[PDB]
Every structure is written in structure tokens, then in C-alpha cells.
Specification:
3 copies of one chain form a homotrimer. The first copy, chain A, has about 45 residues and is mainly α. In chain A, about 95% of the residues lie in helices and about 0% in strands.
Chain lengths: ~45, ~50, ~50
Amino acid sequence: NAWDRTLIENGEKITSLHREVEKVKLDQKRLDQELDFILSQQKELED
Amino acid sequence: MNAWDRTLIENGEKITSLHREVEKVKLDQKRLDQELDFILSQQKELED
Amino acid sequence: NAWDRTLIENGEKITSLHREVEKVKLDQKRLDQELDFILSQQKELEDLLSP
């Protein structure tokens, strides 16, 4: 029925969404380190 | 009480929590984007 | 009615979150692409004169 269907997929999407979120936080941290090093990169070229 | 109720409620708790976390990684992505825009704008030539 | 309406709002919300996450994943992807380009660009530009 429509109720248990919604209640089951909501459960599956919550789990799924949490996992997309963690993968993104990871790439956020990697991208963030690239910025640090690109920053530093231009600054040493100024020499 | 009922398993039905409790699952609804707990999905409720789980969603509110994901909401904050998603607000968090949007703030961060926007922060990242504006830091690059800033780094690029600061590159500024001098040749020579 | 409160049960039904919590079921719907839950469904609406989690769906709206997937969309936000998707949108963030797209910006990340574009940002990663942009850094790859910048990295390639600054490799050429100091190979050209340094030190």
C-alpha cells in the first residue's frame, strides 16, 4: 500500500543521503587542501 | 509507542539531522568557491 | 491525519535534501575541473621562467 511504500523508501533514502553527504565532506576536505597549495604555489612563484 | 509511529518519528529525527549536515556542506562549498575567486583575483600580473 | 502528514512532509523533505546534495556535488565537480585547469596552467607558467 501507499503508506508502507513511503515509509520504506524514506528509510532507504535517509541512509542513502547520509552516505552521499559523507562522500561530499571528504571531497570538500581534499578540494580545500588543493586551494591551500595553489595559494602557496603562486606565492613562491613570486620570488 | 507502536513500531509504525516510532519509525515515523525516528525518520523525523534522522532527517532533521541530515538537514543541518546538508546546510553545513553548502556553506562550505560556497566558501570554497569564493576562496578560489579570491585567489584568482589576487594572482595579478607584473611582467615585469 | 498527523501520521499521514508526517509521512508526507518526511518524504518531501528527504527528497528536497537529495536535490540540494546533488547540486553541491555538481559544484564540487566543476570546482575540481577548475583546479585541474589552474594546476595545469601554473605548471606551464613557472616552467616558462624559474628560477
